Amino acid sequence: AEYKFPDPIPEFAEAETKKFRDHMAKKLAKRDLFEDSVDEIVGVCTEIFETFLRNEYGGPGTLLVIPFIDMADTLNERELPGGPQAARAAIKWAQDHVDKDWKEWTGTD
Amino acid sequence: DRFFFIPEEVHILPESSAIMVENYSIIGVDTRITLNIRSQVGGLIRVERKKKRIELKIFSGDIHFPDKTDKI
C-alpha cells in the first residue's frame, strides 16, 4: 500500500512559525541588501511558511522545496529586494530546527 | 596529477519495489529508501524508471537558486 504521513499539527505549526519568525527577522536585519524592507519581506515569508506547516508538512520526509520557491518568486513579483536571499535563509533555518522540533513535539525518534 | 570523486549514492531497484521517498525531495542521514534499504547520505532525491528497473540516486550538495542577473 501507499504510505500515509502524519497529519499536520496546528499547535506545532504556530510554535514553529513564531520561532521561525524571530530567527529570520534578526538575521536579515544584519544585511544591508534589505534596508527598510525588513518588515514586509518578513511578513510575506511568515504567512507562506505557516501555510505549509498547517497543511502540507507532516513530519520527516515532508520538507518540500516547493514552498521555498514560493517566497523567492513572490518577492521578485512584489519588487522586494533580496528575493533569492530570503528564500536561501528560510530553507537553511528549516533544515536545522524544523526536523528536530517535530520529533521532540510528537515524542517520536 | 589530479583526480576527482563525486559522492553519489546510486541505487538500482526492481520495478516491483516500493519507494518511500518522492522525486525531487530533500532527505537526511539514515532516511529510509525501501523497506530493507536505508540511505547512508541524505540530500536531493532523483528517481528514473526504466522498462524493467527503477534507478534511484541520492544527491548530496548545496542547493542554490538562479538570479535575474546570473548568466548560468
Name chain A contacts of B63, Cβ cutoff 8 Å.
65, 91
How is A13-72 classified by DSSP, letter by letter?
HHHHHHHHHHHHHHHHHT-TTSTT-HHHHHHHHHHHHHHHHHHT--STT---SHHHHHHH
Which resolution, in Å, applies to this structure? 2.6
The grid coordinates of residue B50 equal 526504466
**DSSP assignment, residue B44?**
E
Which residue in the set A63, A64, A72 is minimally distant from B65, CB to CB? A72
Closest partner CB to A3 (pick from B20, B26, B65): B20
Q: Which residue of B has its CA nearest to A85?
A: B65
Using the structure block, give the residue that is written with the C-alpha cell 547520505.
B41
Q: End-to-end alpha-carbon separation of chain B, Å? A: 29
In B, which residues are within 8 Å of A84 by CB distance? 65-67
DSSP, res B65: -
From its phi and psi, is residue A7 left (phi > 0), alpha (psi between -120 and 50) or beta?
A: beta
